[PDB]
Design a protein around this ligand. Sequence first.
Ligand SMILES: [K+]
Ligand SMILES: [K+]
Ligand SMILES: [K+]
Ligand SMILES: [K+]
Ligand SMILES: [K+]
Ligand SMILES: [Mg+2]
Ligand SMILES: [Mg+2]
Ligand SMILES: [Mg+2]
Lengths: 160, 129, 120, 191, 97
Amino acid sequence: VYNRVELKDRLVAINRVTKVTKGGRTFTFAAIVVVGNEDGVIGWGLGKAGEVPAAIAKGVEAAKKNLIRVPVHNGTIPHEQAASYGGASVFLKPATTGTGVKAGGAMRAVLDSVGVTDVLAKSKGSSNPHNLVKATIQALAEMRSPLMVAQNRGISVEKV
Amino acid sequence: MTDPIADYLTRLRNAIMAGHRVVSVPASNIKKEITKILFDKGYILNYKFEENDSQGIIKVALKYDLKVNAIKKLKRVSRPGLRKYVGYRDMPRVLNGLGIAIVSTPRGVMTDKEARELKVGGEVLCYVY
Amino acid sequence: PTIQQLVRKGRESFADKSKSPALNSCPQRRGVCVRVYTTTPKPNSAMRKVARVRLTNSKEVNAYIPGEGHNLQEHSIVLVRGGRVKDLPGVRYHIVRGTLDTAGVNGRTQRRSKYGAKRP
Amino acid sequence: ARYTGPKSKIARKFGDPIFGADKVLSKKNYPPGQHGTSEYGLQLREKQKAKYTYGVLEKQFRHLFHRAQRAVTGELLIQFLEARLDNVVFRLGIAPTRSAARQLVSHRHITVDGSVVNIPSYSVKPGQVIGVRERSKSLEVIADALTGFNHSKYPWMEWDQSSLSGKLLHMPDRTDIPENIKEQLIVELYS
Amino acid sequence: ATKIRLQRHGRKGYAFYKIVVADSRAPRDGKFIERIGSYNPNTNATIDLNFERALYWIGVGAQPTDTARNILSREGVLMMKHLLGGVKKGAFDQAAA
RNA sequence: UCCCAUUAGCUUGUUGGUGAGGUAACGGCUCACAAGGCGACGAUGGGUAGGGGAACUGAGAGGUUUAUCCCCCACACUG
RNA sequence: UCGCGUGAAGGAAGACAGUCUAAGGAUUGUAAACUUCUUUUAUACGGGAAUAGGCGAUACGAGUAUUGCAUUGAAUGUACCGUAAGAAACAGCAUCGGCUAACUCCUGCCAGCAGCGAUACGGAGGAUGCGAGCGUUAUCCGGAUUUAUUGGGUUUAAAGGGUGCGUAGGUUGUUCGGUAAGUCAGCGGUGGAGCGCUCAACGUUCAGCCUGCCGUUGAAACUGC
RNA sequence: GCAGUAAACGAUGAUUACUAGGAGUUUGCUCAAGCUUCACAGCGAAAGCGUUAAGUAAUCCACCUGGGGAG
RNA sequence: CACUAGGGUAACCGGUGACUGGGGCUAAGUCGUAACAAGGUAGCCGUACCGGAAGGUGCGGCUGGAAC
Ligand SMILES: [K+]
Ligand SMILES: [K+]
Ligand SMILES: [K+]
Ligand SMILES: [K+]
Ligand SMILES: [K+]
Ligand SMILES: [Mg+2]
Ligand SMILES: [Mg+2]
Ligand SMILES: [Mg+2]
């Protein structure tokens, strides 16, 4: 995964995460954030702070710190790709130019942050936000451009 | 042995996973054809055939970048338990045209591109990309 | 399983049961009020009005009476529809208000069509 | 059916002057109700804005949407909405507002290609003539809206005041139609 | 017997007839052997007709109804009198009138 | 071209041959030697359905159901 | 199921409701003042669905004139007065979801779920959907990959037979030739653009699949023999 | 001579081919069989498995489709 | 020759019956404390015998057990 170290922020989900102590229950606040510039660079992070704005800010900082470069062309994907992370599995396929993003939720947030316009996306695992976004970014990272495939194989006129 | 072609694909895949540079195989005619197809399509560095007292040996030197192999996935399609036959009009595209499918046809053993050019179908041996 | 195992045996698909089996694939049935009584919920502690009714399809069931104020009594012809109550084991049917012997709720000005009350 | 209700309430709800100019657009401009949002809320606001500004109900709007999908879908849905008898009559200036245009079309006052058409949802293809009835060219209300105003700010209408007719050159592109509607939101909602 | 007739294939208030070749025992809009044209009495009356097939069936001996006989009288299908070789060999042209 | 093996053997004109009769017509269709035939690729027995194109519905794989319509089959209180 | 109407443009913050003694919501909403009639009513004209004796002459076909013929039916449509006049409901507003004040009750009740017994129960005021409909129940599909050939699994969540031998069945190292059953190919047979509904549902025509079955010619890489 | 059950357990069916290292041990002689625990890639929900796989593949068999009712 | 009608034995599909036994859910009134910690005698599987009741004991097996 090429790290490639302005991107807008998208809040995927927040969680009311608790703790048990003899005195009582102490509550934290977690948040998954994805940063992207709709260009081919997307990062994700997890903020774990007390207040909701503090958690969102920490997640934004973590997502900005951890960024990768996703090879894209126009607004579609070069080929179909399936990837599983944890209890979640994702499948992405290219679609027609006048189709838009056909998926909702964490998949929609990740694909909007990466800027892909036309894509057919389906989730076959669980609806966990962490594993879902991680599987989607893994699927995007394992994606090879036609130029990259040509460079790895040799000649660039292999498709003929 | 049950499926020698699947065994050949598995040997190649295991060598790629282990990051070896060469791999040896007990030779066969259809496997000689498959490795010739792979070499002319640009997935391995080179090959060599050694005709010994046995059926023979195939030695394949694989292709690595300046450390990623040129081959990403090998998938056997027509297994003995379920044979797959297709025509030229319904032949499949592997990795949306960036990968190949080895196909045995009455005109010989070639890929899906050459098979669709020659308008002939047959057995789909494997998907390679 | 293997391909030959599937060829020999195959796959078996079950049938989903109907949530209202006493209706016999009908929207509503007609019955007579065999008994009119009151039941206690399974953390609610209310007094829910129910009627045991013998439907014309040769079946006896328990039907809840929604709303506040029922003019029904024993041996009354009622219209019974589907729909169960969560906090009451047993009962799984409702009695339509404003149909046959059952009368609409008096003094209702909202949700009138669900309790059979005309426009005032 | 038709809305036939209060218009300033919708105007203050949506902020934009969809029906036209009013004093309430600048005085007491806030959503209605004594007590006065998720992306569902904004998408619903956009769809209802289009429906209220074009006088279309839900089933007809859905039919228009999937007709546009069959034949950018959000881009040509807006021109499909614009290509309507009442809307074209209103844009030709012969009637003050879209409700007035709808009433004029529904009554026996408007002809298409010389034949009177009184369906105020008839799609008007390019290269067609829409004109006032020859028996209704001398109405007191019919003339003050067209004559005097004479906006003619749309580069897809030909007016020809010497015949009181009008022609649609072609379907205008999505940038030249002065409607503040984000079609991406509506196509995402209906997708 | 084999007949040439019209089946009402349209909408209420708009009669559109299909000219077919069918047995006399078949239902009006049911089974037929061959479709040979269309007919619409609402216009001022558009008639589609397969000339060759209509000639073949009227030659093998399919009896047309009254309206189908009028439709065959139009479009010059009953020229079998002229085509019977009535002490001649040329073909006249009455279609221009 | 539906389920049941908590349905394993079934059939004695049943399988074939000769001859005759009968039929629009071949034929155990019927009437006067050899013995067979059919079954774990499900015979036989039991339960339930009229069958298709349509129609509805799924990207596809398909599936559901015959409400109107069309084609075939069976029936006309029961034999 | 489709289409239309229940009016169109201006008119400041009436009386009556709510929530706060004034302010805000109803609210440009009503009331008058100016036009229009789709539609209803009363009258008139009123289509279309209706097309089917001589003159060649082969002596009869066949081609040409005339005649009556509408159940629907004042039915489409066209035209004439005098009028906004005759024409809007239903559901839900604590999360999922679009939509919030006050009074009741504090059991009566409500619910698809988290459940509340109230920004959840009943009413009053406003709000939000849809709209001649709106909800409730019943039945069937998809999401469901919840039978997984495409496309699931079996250490601990359900799931390896106590272990072997073995019948039917399923699978078959390498190579040289034949055949043509599987496989492949060819050739035959069969089974979106307009037009009219004033628009639309809907009628109707041609470009367009027949990719299922059968016949007949060839190919031999792979499976079978 | 019957009976045919078990936490009859590695709670892990049989066969074939391939893929990293450390610590011991038995037999046949540094090599090959076997025998058990830490441990790459990979797999897994995790505990963990890891050349004796629960990794990569192929062939056949057995079994599962929410919990009680109920073996 | 067989449509029926008649007697009789045999099936299958069904009702009812003096009396006699499981299961589910709601109450929880009573009696003990079997399991969850070494749950106060480690637990569980099979089998046999014996008890108001959960259970106890004998023989073999397992760790899905401590503790040494
Ligand atoms: K005519
Ligand atoms: K380990
Ligand atoms: K105890
Ligand atoms: K104990
Ligand atoms: K043991
Ligand atoms: Mg309607
Ligand atoms: Mg288990
Ligand atoms: Mg075992």
